[PDB]
Design a binder for this molecule. Structure first.
Ligand SMILES: *[C@@H]1O[C@H](CO)[C@@H](O)[C@H](O)[C@H]1NC(C)=O
Ligand SMILES: *[C@@H]1O[C@H](CO)[C@@H](O)[C@H](O)[C@H]1NC(C)=O
Lengths: 50, 50
C-alpha cells in the first residue's frame, strides 16, 4: 500500500479565536544514547602470521 | 592438525567419527587423542599487550 503520513487536522483558525489549555500532564520521556565502543586492540603480527 | 596451546580434559562429547572441534569463528578449540579417545580442549598459550 501507499503509506500514510498521519491523520489530517484542519486547525480551527480564525482571526479572533484562541485555544488555551485548562489542564496538563507531566510526561516522562526516555531517551537513550550510545557513549563508548568496546575497546579493541590487535597484535597484528599474531593475527597475520599466527 | 599442527598448533600451539594448552591441552586439558573436557566435558565435550564428540560423535564417534568426529576428530576435531571448532568454535563459532572456525577456530579449533578441541581434539580427540588418536591412541586413547579422550576429548581434549585446546586454548591459546597465554598472551597479552605489554
Ligand atoms: C486534570 O487532569 C487530571 C488527570 O490527569 C484529573 O484528575 C483532574 O480532575 C483534571 N483537572 C481539571 C481541572 O480538569
Ligand atoms: C593403542 O595401543 C595400546 C597398547 O597396545 C592400547 O592400550 C590402547 O588401548 C590402543 N588404543 C587404540 C585406540 O587402539
Amino acid at each position: 500500500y501507499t503509506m500514510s503520513l498521519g491523520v489530517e487536522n484542519s486547525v480551527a483558525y480564525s482571526n479572533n479565536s484562541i485555544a488555551i489549555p485548562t489542564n496538563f500532564t507531566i510526561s516522562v520521556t526516555t531517551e537513550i544514547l550510545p557513549v563508548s565502543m568496546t575497546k579493541t586492540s590487535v597484535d597484528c603480527t599474531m593475527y597475520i602470521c599466527g | 592438525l599442527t598448533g600451539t596451546g594448552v591441552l586439558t580434559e573436557s566435558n565435550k562429547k564428540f560423535l564417534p567419527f568426529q576428530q576435531f572441534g571448532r568454535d563459532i569463528a572456525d577456530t579449533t578449540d578441541a581434539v580427540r587423542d588418536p591412541q586413547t579417545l579422550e576429548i581434549l580442549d585446546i586454548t591459546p598459550c597465554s598472551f597479552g599487550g605489554v
